[PDB]
Amino acid sequence: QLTPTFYDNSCPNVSNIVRDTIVNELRSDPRIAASILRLHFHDCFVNGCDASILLDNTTSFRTEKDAFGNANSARGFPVIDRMKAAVESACPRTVSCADLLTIAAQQSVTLAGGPSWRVPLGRRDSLQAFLDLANANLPAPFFTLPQLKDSFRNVGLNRSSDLVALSGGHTFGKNQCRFIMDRLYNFSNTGLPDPTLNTTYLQTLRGLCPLNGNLSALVDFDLRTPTIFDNKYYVNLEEQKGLIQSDQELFSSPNATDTIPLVRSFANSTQTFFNAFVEAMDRMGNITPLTGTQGQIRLNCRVVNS
Ligand code: HEM
Ligand SMILES: [Ca+2]
Ligand SMILES: [Ca+2]
Ligand SMILES: [O]
Incomplete structure (x- = not known):
C-alpha cells in the first residue's frame, strides 16, 4: 500500500x-x-x-x-x-x-x-x-466525451469526477494551434467552426491561429489565468470558452448529463474543485x-x- x-x-x-x-x-x-x-x-x-x-x-x-x-x-x-x-x-x-x-x-x-x-x-x-x-x-483533444470516458476507464479511473477534476489540469499551460484548427475553420467536415466555441473567443483564437499559419504556435489553455492553478478553467467551460474539444465537451456534449453538474460545482467553489482534484490526483x-x-x-x- x-x-x-x-x-x-x-x-x-x-x-x-x-x-x-x-x-x-x-x-x-x-x-x-x-x-x-x-x-x-x-x-x-x-x-x-x-x-x-x-x-x-x-x-x-x-x-x-x-x-x-x-x-x-x-x-x-x-x-x-x-x-x-x-x-x-x-x-x-x-x-x-x-x-x-x-x-x-x-x-x-x-x-x-x-x-x-x-x-x-x-x-x-x-x-x-x-x-x-x-x-x-x-487521450486526444479530438476525442468525444464517450471516448474520453473510455480512455479514463481503460486505465482504471471509472468516475466522471476523475475526468472532470483532472481535466482541470488545463487551468494553466500551453496548447499548439494544430490541435484546434478544426474547431476554428472546419469542424467534423462541416466547413464551419465548432458551434460549442464562443463566437467572440472564436475570433480571438482565429487571430492567434490563422488558417495555414504556424501550427506549432502556442496558446493558453486558460484565457482567464494562464499560469495560475485555479478553478477558472471551469468558468470558461460554462461560457463555451474551453480551448480544445475535449475541454468543452465536459460541458456541451450530448453525453454530459453527468459531467455538467461537476463542471458547475467546480466553477462555483474553489474548495470543491481543489478537494476533487486532490482526490482524483491520488487515484490517478x-x-x-x-x-x-x-x-x-x-x-x-x-x-x-x-
Ligand atoms: C482529458 C483528456 C486530456 C486531453 C485530450 C488532453 C490534451 C492536451 C493537449 C492537446 C495539450 C497540448 C499539447 C501541446 O500543445 O503540445 C495538453 C497540455 C496540457 N495538459 Fe492535457 N489533456 C488531457 C488531460 C490532462 C490531465 C488529466 C492533466 C493533468 C492532471 C493535463 C495537463 C495538461 C497540462 C498542464 C498541459 C500543458 C503542458 C505544457 O504547457 O507543457 N491534461 N493536454
Ligand atoms: Ca507509465
Ligand atoms: Ca488558471
Ligand atoms: O494533457
Whole structure:
C-alpha cells in the first residue's frame, strides 16, 4: 500500500529538494510547472505511474517520448534529471523516479497556486517503456466525451469526477494551434467552426491561429489565468470558452448529463474543485504501481539500472 510517509526516515528532504528545483526553473521557464504535472499524467496513463515515460530509446524497446501524445509536446525531462541528481546526492538509491515525478507534479500544482497535500509514496520504476501502449492509452483533444470516458476507464479511473477534476489540469499551460484548427475553420467536415466555441473567443483564437499559419504556435489553455492553478478553467467551460474539444465537451456534449453538474460545482467553489482534484490526483497516482521489491530504484531516470 502506498503511503505519504514512505520517505520520512530515508529521505525527509525529498519534497523540499523537488520544490527548490521547480522554483528555480520557473524563473526562466514559467511553463515548467504545467509541463511537469502533465508528465506525471502521461506516466500514469501508460502501465501506471512507473516512470516508464522517462526512459529513452534502446535497441530492444522504443521510448514513449515518440508517442503521438508525447512527441514535440511533452517537455521538462532535463528538469526531472536535475532534481533526481540532487535527490540522489541527498539520499543515494532511495527515491524512485516514479515517486519523484509524482512529488514534482504535486509541488508544481502547489507552486502555481493550487492545493497542497502529501502524495502517497512507495512506487518503483519500470524495467521497460511502452510506446504502443502510450499510443493506445493517451487521450486526444479530438476525442468525444464517450471516448474520453473510455480512455479514463481503460486505465482504471471509472468516475466522471476523475475526468472532470483532472481535466482541470488545463487551468494553466500551453496548447499548439494544430490541435484546434478544426474547431476554428472546419469542424467534423462541416466547413464551419465548432458551434460549442464562443463566437467572440472564436475570433480571438482565429487571430492567434490563422488558417495555414504556424501550427506549432502556442496558446493558453486558460484565457482567464494562464499560469495560475485555479478553478477558472471551469468558468470558461460554462461560457463555451474551453480551448480544445475535449475541454468543452465536459460541458456541451450530448453525453454530459453527468459531467455538467461537476463542471458547475467546480466553477462555483474553489474548495470543491481543489478537494476533487486532490482526490482524483491520488487515484490517478494509484494506478497499477510497482511496489515492494517489484521494479527498481532507477539511478538515472533515462535508463534501467544495469
Ligand atoms: C482529458 C483528456 C486530456 C486531453 C485530450 C488532453 C490534451 C492536451 C493537449 C492537446 C495539450 C497540448 C499539447 C501541446 O500543445 O503540445 C495538453 C497540455 C496540457 N495538459 Fe492535457 N489533456 C488531457 C488531460 C490532462 C490531465 C488529466 C492533466 C493533468 C492532471 C493535463 C495537463 C495538461 C497540462 C498542464 C498541459 C500543458 C503542458 C505544457 O504547457 O507543457 N491534461 N493536454
Ligand atoms: Ca507509465
Ligand atoms: Ca488558471
Ligand atoms: O494533457
